[PDB]
Amino acid sequence: SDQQLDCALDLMRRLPPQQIEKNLSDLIDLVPSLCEDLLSSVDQPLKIARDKVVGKDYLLCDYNRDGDSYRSPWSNKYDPPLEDGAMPSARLRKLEVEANNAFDQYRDLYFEGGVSSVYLWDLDHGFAGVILIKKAGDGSKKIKGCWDSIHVVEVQEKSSGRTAHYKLTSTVMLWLQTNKTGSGTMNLGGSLTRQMEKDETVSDSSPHIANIGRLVEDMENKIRSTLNEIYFGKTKDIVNGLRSIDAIPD
Amino acid sequence: SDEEKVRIAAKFITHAPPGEFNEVFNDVRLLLNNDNLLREGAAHAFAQYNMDQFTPVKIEGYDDQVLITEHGDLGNGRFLDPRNKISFKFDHLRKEASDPQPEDTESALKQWRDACDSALRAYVKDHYPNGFCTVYGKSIDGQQTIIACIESHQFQPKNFWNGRWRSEWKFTITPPTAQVAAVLKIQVHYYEDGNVQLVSHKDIQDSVQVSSDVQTAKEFIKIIENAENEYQTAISENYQTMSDTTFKALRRQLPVTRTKIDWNKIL
Lengths: 250, 267
Description:
- The structure holds 2 protein chains of 2 kinds.
- By secondary structure, chain A is α+β, with helices and mostly antiparallel strands.
- Chain A has 5 helices and 10 strands; from the N terminus they run H-H-H-E-E-E-E-E-H-E-E-E-E-E-H.
- Chain A has 2 domains: 1-88, Up-down Bundle (Methane Monooxygenase Hydroxylase, Chain G, domain 1), CATH 1.20.58; 89-250, F-actin capping protein, beta subunit (Aspartate Aminotransferase, domain 1), CATH 3.90.1150.210.
- Chain B has helices at residues 2-14, 21-32, 35-41, 44-52, 110-127, 213-250, 263-266, and strands at 55-57, 66-68, 73-75, 78-81, 86-91, 96-102, 131-140, 143-156, 161-174, 177-190, 195-209.
- In chain B, the strands form 3 sheets. Chain B has a 5-stranded antiparallel beta sheet. Chain B has a 4-stranded antiparallel beta sheet with strand order 3-4-5-6, with no helix packed on it.
- At the A-B interface, helix 1, helix 2, helix 4, strand 8 and strand 9 of A face helix 1, helix 2, helix 5, strand 8 and strand 9 of B.
- Strand 10 of chain A pairs antiparallel with strand 11 of chain B, so a sheet runs across the interface.
- Chain B: InterPro entries: CapZ_alpha, CapZ_alpha/beta, CapZ_alpha/beta_2, CapZ_alpha_1, F-actin_cap_asu_CS.
Protein backbone atom coordinates (compact mmCIF):
# COMPACT_ATOMS: atom_id res chain seq x y z
CA SER A 1 0.00 0.00 0.00
CA ASP A 2 2.76 2.49 0.97
CA GLN A 3 4.94 1.00 -1.78
CA GLN A 4 1.92 0.45 -4.09
CA LEU A 5 1.33 4.18 -3.83
CA ASP A 6 4.91 4.94 -4.88
CA CYS A 7 4.43 2.56 -7.84
CA ALA A 8 1.09 4.03 -8.94
CA LEU A 9 2.48 7.58 -8.80
CA ASP A 10 5.68 6.63 -10.73
CA LEU A 11 3.52 4.88 -13.31
CA MET A 12 1.30 7.96 -13.86
CA ARG A 13 4.42 10.06 -14.39
CA ARG A 14 5.52 7.67 -17.17
CA LEU A 15 2.35 6.95 -19.16
CA PRO A 16 0.91 9.24 -21.97
CA PRO A 17 -0.21 12.63 -20.59
CA GLN A 18 -3.18 12.72 -23.05
CA GLN A 19 -4.55 9.63 -21.38
CA ILE A 20 -4.62 10.78 -17.73
CA GLU A 21 -8.37 10.40 -17.21
CA LYS A 22 -8.56 6.92 -18.77
CA ASN A 23 -5.23 5.68 -17.33
CA LEU A 24 -6.07 6.92 -13.84
CA SER A 25 -9.50 5.32 -14.04
CA ASP A 26 -7.89 2.07 -15.25
CA LEU A 27 -5.29 2.37 -12.44
CA ILE A 28 -8.09 2.77 -9.89
CA ASP A 29 -9.78 -0.36 -11.35
CA LEU A 30 -6.84 -2.46 -10.12
CA VAL A 31 -5.89 -0.93 -6.76
CA PRO A 32 -9.18 0.60 -5.45
CA SER A 33 -7.48 0.89 -2.06
CA LEU A 34 -5.49 3.88 -3.32
CA CYS A 35 -8.48 5.55 -5.06
CA GLU A 36 -8.65 8.61 -2.72
CA ASP A 37 -4.88 8.90 -2.52
CA LEU A 38 -4.64 8.85 -6.30
CA LEU A 39 -7.43 11.32 -7.01
CA SER A 40 -5.78 14.03 -4.88
CA SER A 41 -2.05 13.66 -5.69
CA VAL A 42 -2.17 12.92 -9.44
CA ASP A 43 -2.25 15.99 -11.73
CA GLN A 44 -5.58 15.98 -13.64
CA PRO A 45 -7.15 18.29 -16.28
CA LEU A 46 -9.57 20.81 -14.73
CA LYS A 47 -13.32 20.21 -15.00
CA ILE A 48 -15.82 23.05 -15.62
CA ALA A 49 -19.29 23.29 -14.11
CA ARG A 50 -22.02 25.84 -14.73
CA ASP A 51 -23.55 27.83 -11.86
CA LYS A 52 -27.29 27.14 -12.14
CA VAL A 53 -28.31 30.38 -10.46
CA VAL A 54 -26.44 32.94 -12.60
CA GLY A 55 -25.33 30.79 -15.55
CA LYS A 56 -21.55 31.32 -15.28
CA ASP A 57 -18.74 28.77 -15.42
CA TYR A 58 -16.55 27.78 -12.53
CA LEU A 59 -13.82 25.23 -12.02
CA LEU A 60 -13.70 22.13 -9.77
CA CYS A 61 -10.97 21.12 -7.34
CA ASP A 62 -10.81 19.62 -3.88
CA TYR A 63 -10.84 23.03 -2.14
CA ASN A 64 -14.41 23.95 -3.25
CA ARG A 65 -15.62 20.43 -2.63
CA ASP A 66 -17.79 19.10 0.19
CA GLY A 67 -18.73 15.41 -0.11
CA ASP A 68 -19.86 15.00 -3.69
CA SER A 69 -20.84 18.69 -4.08
CA TYR A 70 -18.96 21.74 -5.30
CA ARG A 71 -19.36 25.36 -4.26
CA SER A 72 -19.68 28.02 -6.93
CA PRO A 73 -17.67 31.22 -6.42
CA TRP A 74 -20.47 33.16 -8.14
CA SER A 75 -23.52 32.29 -6.02
CA ASN A 76 -21.66 30.71 -3.02
CA LYS A 77 -24.00 27.69 -3.25
CA TYR A 78 -23.27 23.96 -3.49
CA ASP A 79 -24.31 21.78 -6.39
CA PRO A 80 -25.78 19.28 -5.74
CA PRO A 81 -27.48 21.31 -3.00
CA LEU A 82 -26.42 20.80 0.58
CA GLU A 83 -28.10 21.94 3.79
CA ASP A 84 -24.75 22.61 5.59
CA GLY A 85 -21.85 22.75 3.12
CA ALA A 86 -18.67 24.34 4.40
CA MET A 87 -18.66 28.10 3.72
CA PRO A 88 -16.10 30.86 4.08
CA SER A 89 -16.71 33.48 6.80
CA ALA A 90 -18.51 36.68 5.67
CA ARG A 91 -15.19 38.53 5.70
CA LEU A 92 -13.26 35.87 3.76
CA ARG A 93 -16.17 35.57 1.30
CA LYS A 94 -15.86 39.33 0.60
CA LEU A 95 -12.16 38.87 -0.22
CA GLU A 96 -12.99 35.74 -2.33
CA VAL A 97 -15.30 37.78 -4.52
CA GLU A 98 -12.74 40.57 -4.95
CA ALA A 99 -10.14 37.85 -5.85
CA ASN A 100 -12.41 36.17 -8.42
CA ASN A 101 -13.05 39.48 -10.11
CA ALA A 102 -9.34 40.48 -10.13
CA PHE A 103 -8.19 37.12 -11.48
CA ASP A 104 -10.97 37.18 -14.15
CA GLN A 105 -9.34 40.35 -15.49
CA TYR A 106 -5.88 38.75 -15.23
CA ARG A 107 -7.23 35.79 -17.28
CA ASP A 108 -8.88 38.02 -19.87
CA LEU A 109 -5.58 39.97 -20.31
CA TYR A 110 -3.12 37.01 -20.57
CA PHE A 111 -5.37 34.23 -21.93
CA GLU A 112 -8.09 36.15 -23.89
CA GLY A 113 -10.64 33.45 -23.05
CA GLY A 114 -10.96 30.35 -20.88
CA VAL A 115 -12.29 30.10 -17.35
CA SER A 116 -10.85 31.13 -13.94
CA SER A 117 -12.05 30.61 -10.34
CA VAL A 118 -10.67 31.47 -6.89
CA TYR A 119 -11.68 29.79 -3.63
CA LEU A 120 -10.42 30.93 -0.22
CA TRP A 121 -10.29 29.23 3.18
CA ASP A 122 -9.34 30.23 6.71
CA LEU A 123 -6.11 29.38 8.54
CA ASP A 124 -4.95 30.16 12.13
CA HIS A 125 -2.59 33.06 11.24
CA GLY A 126 -4.09 34.15 7.95
CA PHE A 127 -5.75 32.36 5.06
CA ALA A 128 -5.22 30.34 1.94
CA GLY A 129 -6.54 30.08 -1.57
CA VAL A 130 -6.51 28.37 -4.89
CA ILE A 131 -6.50 30.08 -8.27
CA LEU A 132 -7.63 27.83 -11.18
CA ILE A 133 -7.32 28.73 -14.86
CA LYS A 134 -8.29 26.66 -17.88
CA LYS A 135 -7.89 27.72 -21.49
CA ALA A 136 -8.61 25.27 -24.31
CA GLY A 137 -7.72 25.72 -27.95
CA ASP A 138 -10.50 24.38 -30.07
CA GLY A 139 -11.44 25.51 -33.58
CA SER A 140 -9.04 23.67 -35.90
CA LYS A 141 -8.51 20.11 -37.14
CA LYS A 142 -4.83 20.85 -37.62
CA ILE A 143 -3.97 22.56 -34.32
CA LYS A 144 -5.30 21.93 -30.80
CA GLY A 145 -4.16 22.55 -27.22
CA CYS A 146 -5.05 23.15 -23.57
CA TRP A 147 -3.54 25.01 -20.63
CA ASP A 148 -4.59 24.18 -17.03
CA SER A 149 -3.02 25.95 -14.04
CA ILE A 150 -3.61 25.62 -10.32
CA HIS A 151 -1.98 27.94 -7.78
CA VAL A 152 -2.23 27.29 -4.04
CA VAL A 153 -1.25 30.31 -1.97
CA GLU A 154 -0.79 30.47 1.81
CA VAL A 155 -0.84 33.83 3.54
CA GLN A 156 0.65 34.51 6.99
CA GLU A 157 0.12 38.06 8.25
CA LYS A 158 3.18 39.51 10.09
CA SER A 159 4.45 42.83 11.69
CA SER A 160 1.00 43.69 13.09
CA GLY A 161 -0.46 43.30 9.60
CA ARG A 162 1.98 45.62 7.84
CA THR A 163 3.66 42.72 5.96
CA ALA A 164 2.77 39.13 5.16
CA HIS A 165 4.50 35.93 4.14
CA TYR A 166 3.15 34.33 0.94
CA LYS A 167 3.79 30.73 -0.07
CA LEU A 168 2.78 29.76 -3.60
CA THR A 169 2.73 26.28 -5.07
CA SER A 170 1.89 26.22 -8.79
CA THR A 171 1.33 23.47 -11.37
CA VAL A 172 0.75 24.11 -15.08
CA MET A 173 -0.39 21.33 -17.40
CA LEU A 174 0.08 21.93 -21.09
CA TRP A 175 -0.86 19.91 -24.14
CA LEU A 176 -0.46 20.69 -27.79
CA GLN A 177 -1.26 18.77 -30.90
CA THR A 178 -0.68 19.63 -34.57
CA ASN A 179 -1.63 17.54 -37.62
CA LYS A 180 0.22 18.95 -40.66
CA THR A 181 1.37 17.59 -43.96
CA GLY A 182 5.14 17.96 -43.45
CA SER A 183 5.51 17.13 -39.73
CA GLY A 184 2.71 14.56 -39.53
CA THR A 185 1.02 14.36 -36.14
CA MET A 186 2.98 15.89 -33.23
CA ASN A 187 1.65 15.55 -29.66
CA LEU A 188 3.32 17.33 -26.73
CA GLY A 189 1.93 16.79 -23.25
CA GLY A 190 3.10 17.24 -19.65
CA SER A 191 3.39 19.59 -16.70
CA LEU A 192 5.60 21.57 -14.38
CA THR A 193 5.31 22.37 -10.66
CA ARG A 194 7.05 25.30 -8.92
CA GLN A 195 7.15 26.85 -5.45
CA MET A 196 7.96 30.38 -4.36
CA GLU A 197 7.93 32.22 -0.98
CA LYS A 198 8.05 36.04 -0.48
CA ASP A 199 7.36 38.61 2.26
CA GLU A 200 5.68 41.66 0.85
CA THR A 201 4.38 44.81 2.48
CA VAL A 202 0.64 44.99 3.05
CA SER A 203 -1.09 48.38 2.98
CA ASP A 204 -3.98 50.37 1.52
CA SER A 205 -2.16 50.68 -1.79
CA SER A 206 -0.73 47.09 -1.78
CA PRO A 207 -3.46 44.84 -0.42
CA HIS A 208 -3.31 41.02 -0.19
CA ILE A 209 -4.98 40.41 -3.56
CA ALA A 210 -2.57 42.73 -5.32
CA ASN A 211 0.34 40.89 -3.71
CA ILE A 212 -1.18 37.51 -4.66
CA GLY A 213 -1.87 38.81 -8.17
CA ARG A 214 1.76 39.87 -8.70
CA LEU A 215 3.00 36.56 -7.23
CA VAL A 216 0.76 34.48 -9.52
CA GLU A 217 1.50 36.61 -12.60
CA ASP A 218 5.27 36.25 -12.13
CA MET A 219 5.03 32.56 -11.39
CA GLU A 220 3.02 31.93 -14.58
CA ASN A 221 5.41 34.17 -16.63
CA LYS A 222 8.42 32.14 -15.29
CA ILE A 223 6.64 28.81 -15.78
CA ARG A 224 5.63 29.81 -19.34
CA SER A 225 9.28 30.66 -20.07
CA THR A 226 10.48 27.31 -18.70
CA LEU A 227 7.81 25.29 -20.59
CA ASN A 228 8.84 27.04 -23.77
CA GLU A 229 12.40 25.88 -23.22
CA ILE A 230 11.49 22.35 -22.19
CA TYR A 231 8.64 21.73 -24.77
CA PHE A 232 10.09 23.50 -27.80
CA GLY A 233 13.81 23.40 -26.94
CA LYS A 234 14.79 20.29 -24.93
CA THR A 235 12.55 17.74 -26.68
CA LYS A 236 13.71 19.23 -30.02
CA ASP A 237 17.38 18.87 -29.11
CA ILE A 238 16.62 15.22 -28.26
CA VAL A 239 14.88 14.63 -31.66
CA ASN A 240 17.95 16.14 -33.36
CA GLY A 241 20.23 13.70 -31.53
CA LEU A 242 18.24 10.66 -32.75
CA ARG A 243 18.87 11.53 -36.42
CA SER A 244 21.08 13.93 -38.34
CA ILE A 245 20.28 15.43 -41.78
CA ASP A 246 24.02 16.04 -42.39
CA ALA A 247 26.27 13.01 -42.39
CA ILE A 248 27.79 12.19 -39.01
CA PRO A 249 31.55 12.80 -39.19
CA ASP A 250 34.46 10.27 -38.64
CA SER B 1 -12.67 -8.55 -13.51
CA ASP B 2 -9.46 -10.59 -13.08
CA GLU B 3 -9.45 -11.05 -16.86
CA GLU B 4 -9.94 -7.26 -17.00
CA LYS B 5 -7.10 -6.56 -14.52
CA VAL B 6 -4.56 -8.49 -16.65
CA ARG B 7 -5.83 -6.72 -19.78
CA ILE B 8 -5.15 -3.37 -17.99
CA ALA B 9 -1.77 -4.52 -16.74
CA ALA B 10 -0.96 -5.48 -20.37
CA LYS B 11 -2.15 -2.15 -21.77
CA PHE B 12 0.04 -0.36 -19.21
CA ILE B 13 3.20 -2.38 -20.00
CA THR B 14 2.60 -1.80 -23.72
CA HIS B 15 2.61 1.97 -23.24
CA ALA B 16 5.98 2.15 -21.48
CA PRO B 17 8.08 5.02 -22.84
CA PRO B 18 11.28 3.93 -24.68
CA GLY B 19 13.97 3.07 -22.16
CA GLU B 20 11.48 2.82 -19.27
CA PHE B 21 10.04 -0.65 -19.74
CA ASN B 22 11.70 -2.12 -16.59
CA GLU B 23 10.29 0.70 -14.43
CA VAL B 24 6.81 0.38 -15.84
CA PHE B 25 6.97 -3.42 -15.62
CA ASN B 26 8.11 -3.17 -11.98
CA ASP B 27 5.27 -0.73 -11.24
CA VAL B 28 2.64 -2.94 -12.81
CA ARG B 29 4.00 -6.09 -11.09
CA LEU B 30 3.84 -4.67 -7.54
CA LEU B 31 0.37 -3.23 -8.34
CA LEU B 32 -1.42 -6.26 -9.79
CA ASN B 33 0.30 -8.33 -7.05
CA ASN B 34 -0.49 -11.60 -8.83
CA ASP B 35 2.79 -12.77 -10.40
CA ASN B 36 0.79 -15.79 -11.59
CA LEU B 37 -1.75 -13.85 -13.73
CA LEU B 38 1.04 -11.52 -14.93
CA ARG B 39 2.82 -14.40 -16.73
CA GLU B 40 -0.50 -15.68 -18.13
CA GLY B 41 -2.22 -12.92 -20.11
CA ALA B 42 0.61 -10.34 -20.21
CA ALA B 43 3.22 -12.35 -22.18
CA HIS B 44 1.61 -11.41 -25.49
CA ALA B 45 2.45 -7.88 -24.28
CA PHE B 46 6.18 -8.29 -23.77
CA ALA B 47 6.50 -9.60 -27.31
CA GLN B 48 4.15 -6.97 -28.69
CA TYR B 49 6.15 -4.25 -26.98
CA ASN B 50 9.46 -5.58 -28.34
CA MET B 51 8.17 -5.80 -31.89
CA ASP B 52 6.36 -2.37 -31.80
CA GLN B 53 9.56 -0.73 -30.51
CA PHE B 54 11.91 -2.43 -33.06
CA THR B 55 14.10 -3.57 -30.13
CA PRO B 56 17.69 -3.95 -31.27
CA VAL B 57 19.54 -7.08 -30.09
CA LYS B 58 23.12 -8.33 -30.21
CA ILE B 59 23.60 -11.96 -31.22
CA GLU B 60 26.87 -13.46 -29.93
CA GLY B 61 29.25 -14.00 -32.84
CA TYR B 62 27.68 -11.42 -35.19
CA ASP B 63 28.96 -7.85 -35.37
CA ASP B 64 25.81 -6.02 -36.08
CA GLN B 65 22.55 -6.01 -34.19
CA VAL B 66 19.24 -7.15 -35.53
CA LEU B 67 15.83 -5.59 -34.87
CA ILE B 68 12.98 -7.52 -33.25
CA THR B 69 9.98 -6.80 -35.48
CA GLU B 70 6.69 -8.41 -36.54
CA HIS B 71 8.35 -8.90 -39.91
CA GLY B 72 11.00 -11.27 -38.58
CA ASP B 73 8.55 -13.19 -36.40
CA LEU B 74 8.91 -16.86 -37.51
CA GLY B 75 6.45 -18.00 -34.87
CA ASN B 76 7.24 -20.38 -31.98
CA GLY B 77 9.40 -17.73 -30.27
CA ARG B 78 11.95 -17.55 -33.10
CA PHE B 79 13.04 -14.44 -35.05
CA LEU B 80 14.83 -14.12 -38.37
CA ASP B 81 18.07 -12.20 -38.88
CA PRO B 82 17.95 -11.87 -42.67
CA ARG B 83 21.42 -10.33 -43.00
CA ASN B 84 23.19 -13.20 -41.24
CA LYS B 85 20.88 -15.95 -42.54
CA ILE B 86 20.01 -17.20 -39.06
CA SER B 87 17.02 -17.62 -36.90
CA PHE B 88 17.24 -17.33 -33.15
CA LYS B 89 15.08 -17.77 -30.10
CA PHE B 90 14.23 -14.47 -28.39
CA ASP B 91 13.37 -14.17 -24.69
CA HIS B 92 11.09 -11.19 -24.52
CA LEU B 93 11.53 -10.85 -20.73
CA ARG B 94 15.37 -10.98 -20.51
CA LYS B 95 15.57 -9.45 -24.03
CA GLU B 96 18.24 -12.00 -24.91
CA ALA B 97 18.86 -13.87 -28.15
CA SER B 98 19.99 -17.50 -28.15
CA ASP B 99 20.13 -20.79 -30.11
CA PRO B 100 21.13 -19.24 -33.44
CA GLN B 101 20.53 -21.67 -36.36
CA PRO B 102 21.22 -21.26 -40.06
CA GLU B 103 18.16 -20.30 -42.14
CA ASP B 104 18.38 -20.21 -45.92
CA THR B 105 15.12 -18.47 -46.69
CA GLU B 106 14.33 -19.35 -50.35
CA SER B 107 16.24 -16.66 -52.27
CA ALA B 108 13.37 -15.18 -54.43
CA LEU B 109 13.94 -11.58 -53.33
CA LYS B 110 17.34 -12.26 -51.76
CA GLN B 111 19.43 -10.23 -54.23
CA TRP B 112 17.07 -7.29 -53.86
CA ARG B 113 17.13 -7.64 -50.08
CA ASP B 114 20.93 -7.77 -49.95
CA ALA B 115 21.31 -4.79 -52.26
CA CYS B 116 18.79 -2.74 -50.14
CA ASP B 117 20.40 -3.88 -46.92
CA SER B 118 23.82 -2.83 -48.12
CA ALA B 119 22.61 0.64 -49.16
CA LEU B 120 20.50 1.07 -46.00
CA ARG B 121 23.30 0.23 -43.59
CA ALA B 122 25.59 2.89 -45.05
CA TYR B 123 22.73 5.39 -44.89
CA VAL B 124 21.89 4.56 -41.24
CA LYS B 125 25.60 4.75 -40.21
CA ASP B 126 25.77 8.24 -41.80
CA HIS B 127 22.50 9.67 -40.32
CA TYR B 128 21.61 7.87 -37.07
CA PRO B 129 24.16 8.15 -34.22
CA ASN B 130 23.24 4.79 -32.53
CA GLY B 131 21.09 3.49 -35.38
CA PHE B 132 20.42 -0.12 -36.42
CA CYS B 133 18.46 -1.46 -39.39
CA THR B 134 17.09 -4.73 -40.79
CA VAL B 135 15.82 -5.42 -44.30
CA TYR B 136 13.40 -8.29 -45.08
CA GLY B 137 12.41 -9.56 -48.52
CA LYS B 138 9.15 -11.44 -48.43
CA SER B 139 6.06 -12.38 -50.37
CA ILE B 140 2.91 -10.76 -49.00
CA ASP B 141 -0.48 -11.76 -50.43
CA GLY B 142 1.45 -12.90 -53.52
CA GLN B 143 3.48 -9.67 -54.06
CA GLN B 144 7.23 -9.34 -53.65
CA THR B 145 7.96 -6.85 -50.83
CA ILE B 146 11.09 -5.22 -49.36
CA ILE B 147 10.61 -4.01 -45.75
CA ALA B 148 13.33 -1.68 -44.43
CA CYS B 149 13.28 -1.01 -40.65
CA ILE B 150 15.39 1.57 -38.83
CA GLU B 151 15.74 2.16 -35.09
CA SER B 152 17.76 4.72 -33.23
CA HIS B 153 17.59 5.51 -29.51
CA GLN B 154 19.28 7.49 -26.78
CA PHE B 155 18.70 6.40 -23.19
CA GLN B 156 20.06 8.88 -20.64
CA PRO B 157 18.35 8.13 -17.29
CA LYS B 158 21.10 10.00 -15.45
CA ASN B 159 20.13 13.09 -17.37
CA PHE B 160 16.41 12.23 -16.93
CA TRP B 161 15.52 11.69 -20.62
CA ASN B 162 15.05 9.02 -23.29
CA GLY B 163 14.22 9.16 -27.01
CA ARG B 164 13.65 6.75 -29.88
CA TRP B 165 13.18 7.05 -33.63
CA ARG B 166 11.59 4.23 -35.66
CA SER B 167 10.96 4.10 -39.36
CA GLU B 168 9.47 1.39 -41.48
CA TRP B 169 9.42 1.40 -45.29
CA LYS B 170 7.54 -1.14 -47.36
CA PHE B 171 8.24 -1.38 -51.05
CA THR B 172 5.78 -3.64 -52.93
CA ILE B 173 7.74 -4.45 -56.09
CA THR B 174 5.84 -4.99 -59.31
CA PRO B 175 8.39 -4.19 -62.04
CA PRO B 176 8.69 -1.64 -63.54
CA THR B 177 6.98 0.01 -60.53
CA ALA B 178 6.80 -0.18 -56.73
CA GLN B 179 4.24 1.03 -54.22
CA VAL B 180 5.78 2.73 -51.17
CA ALA B 181 4.14 2.66 -47.71
CA ALA B 182 6.08 4.13 -44.79
CA VAL B 183 5.54 5.24 -41.20
CA LEU B 184 8.01 7.37 -39.30
CA LYS B 185 7.71 7.57 -35.50
CA ILE B 186 9.39 9.55 -32.74
CA GLN B 187 9.02 9.46 -29.00
CA VAL B 188 10.76 11.58 -26.38
CA HIS B 189 10.37 11.74 -22.59
CA TYR B 190 12.16 14.57 -20.74
CA TYR B 191 11.73 14.71 -16.94
CA GLU B 192 14.79 16.53 -15.51
CA ASP B 193 12.78 19.68 -15.01
CA GLY B 194 9.04 19.06 -15.20
CA ASN B 195 7.75 16.19 -17.27
CA VAL B 196 7.05 16.25 -21.02
CA GLN B 197 6.47 13.70 -23.77
CA LEU B 198 6.53 14.09 -27.50
CA VAL B 199 4.82 11.45 -29.58
CA SER B 200 4.93 11.96 -33.35
CA HIS B 201 4.30 9.93 -36.47
CA LYS B 202 3.98 10.51 -40.24
CA ASP B 203 2.39 8.16 -42.79
CA ILE B 204 3.69 8.07 -46.39
CA GLN B 205 2.04 6.47 -49.41
CA ASP B 206 3.53 6.74 -52.86
CA SER B 207 4.74 5.02 -56.04
CA VAL B 208 8.08 5.03 -57.89
CA GLN B 209 9.72 3.32 -60.85
CA VAL B 210 12.12 0.40 -60.42
CA SER B 211 14.76 -1.15 -62.70
CA SER B 212 17.57 -3.56 -61.60
CA ASP B 213 18.38 -4.51 -57.97
CA VAL B 214 21.50 -2.39 -57.45
CA GLN B 215 20.21 0.76 -59.20
CA THR B 216 16.81 0.47 -57.55
CA ALA B 217 18.21 0.07 -54.01
CA LYS B 218 20.38 3.16 -54.61
CA GLU B 219 17.30 5.17 -55.49
CA PHE B 220 15.16 3.66 -52.67
CA ILE B 221 17.74 5.05 -50.24
CA LYS B 222 17.67 8.50 -51.91
CA ILE B 223 13.87 8.48 -51.58
CA ILE B 224 14.01 7.45 -47.92
CA GLU B 225 16.77 9.98 -47.10
CA ASN B 226 14.85 12.86 -48.69
CA ALA B 227 11.56 11.94 -47.08
CA GLU B 228 13.09 11.50 -43.64
CA ASN B 229 15.00 14.85 -44.00
CA GLU B 230 11.70 16.48 -44.95
CA TYR B 231 9.96 15.17 -41.81
CA GLN B 232 12.82 16.13 -39.54
CA THR B 233 13.01 19.68 -41.09
CA ALA B 234 9.21 20.03 -40.83
CA ILE B 235 9.37 18.94 -37.19
CA SER B 236 11.85 21.68 -36.25
CA GLU B 237 9.86 24.29 -38.26
CA ASN B 238 6.74 23.20 -36.37
CA TYR B 239 8.58 23.57 -33.08
CA GLN B 240 9.25 27.23 -33.99
CA THR B 241 5.60 27.67 -34.97
CA MET B 242 4.28 26.15 -31.71
CA SER B 243 6.74 28.26 -29.70
CA ASP B 244 5.87 31.64 -31.24
CA THR B 245 2.23 31.12 -32.17
CA THR B 246 0.36 28.12 -30.80
CA PHE B 247 1.62 28.63 -27.21
CA LYS B 248 0.68 32.34 -27.46
CA ALA B 249 -2.92 31.47 -28.40
CA LEU B 250 -3.18 29.52 -25.14
CA ARG B 251 -1.41 32.10 -22.93
CA ARG B 252 0.33 35.26 -24.16
CA GLN B 253 3.74 36.33 -22.84
CA LEU B 254 2.35 39.77 -22.13
CA PRO B 255 -1.05 41.40 -22.49
CA VAL B 256 -1.99 43.26 -25.70
CA THR B 257 -0.75 46.51 -24.10
CA ARG B 258 2.65 44.87 -23.47
CA THR B 259 2.77 45.94 -19.83
CA LYS B 260 2.68 43.70 -16.76
CA ILE B 261 -0.64 44.15 -15.04
CA ASP B 262 -1.36 47.08 -12.67
CA TRP B 263 -2.93 45.29 -9.72
CA ASN B 264 -4.02 48.44 -7.81
CA LYS B 265 -6.02 49.69 -10.78
CA ILE B 266 -7.75 46.29 -11.17
CA LEU B 267 -8.65 46.51 -7.48
